[PDB]
Amino acid sequence: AMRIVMGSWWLFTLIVCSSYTANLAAFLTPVRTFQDLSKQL
Amino acid sequence: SFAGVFCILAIGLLLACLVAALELWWNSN
């Protein structure tokens, strides 16, 4: 096959590039939460 | 992202159908 192979390396491209910016979610964002109700819990 | 594989999927199924179309060209000839 040579044609679902297209679906292979594209996921090998896409998902890793899709894996990317969630490191900034781990990276960028003491206090975290500011609501009067949120601190009741 | 939510639909990154979705938009490319039907493109791949279009590319999937050309192979079996040439195999029906073989089933005719």
Entry resolution in angstroms? Answer: 8.1
User: Residue A25: what residue type?
Assistant: A
Q: How far A26 CA sits from the closest chain B CA (Å)?
A: 18
Q: Which residue of B has its CA nearest to A19?
A: B1
| Experimental determination technique | cryo-EM
Tell me the DSSP string of A1-41.
Answer: --SSSHHHHHHHHHHHHHTSTHHHHHH--------TTGGG-
Contact B19 A3 (CB under 8 A): yes
Residues in CB range of A11: below 8 A, 6 or more apart: B5
Residues in CB range of A7: below 8 A, 6 or more apart: B12
**Cα B15 to Cα A4: distance, rounded to the nearest angstrom:** 9
Q: Give the three-state DSSP class for B1.
A: coil
Please tell me the number of Cα atoms within 13 Å of A6 on its side-chain side: 13
Chain B residue numbers touching A4 (CB-CB < 8 A): 12, 16
Scored b (16 or more CB within 10 A) or e, B2-23 reads: eeeeeeeeeeeeeeeeeeeeee
DSSP code at position B29: -
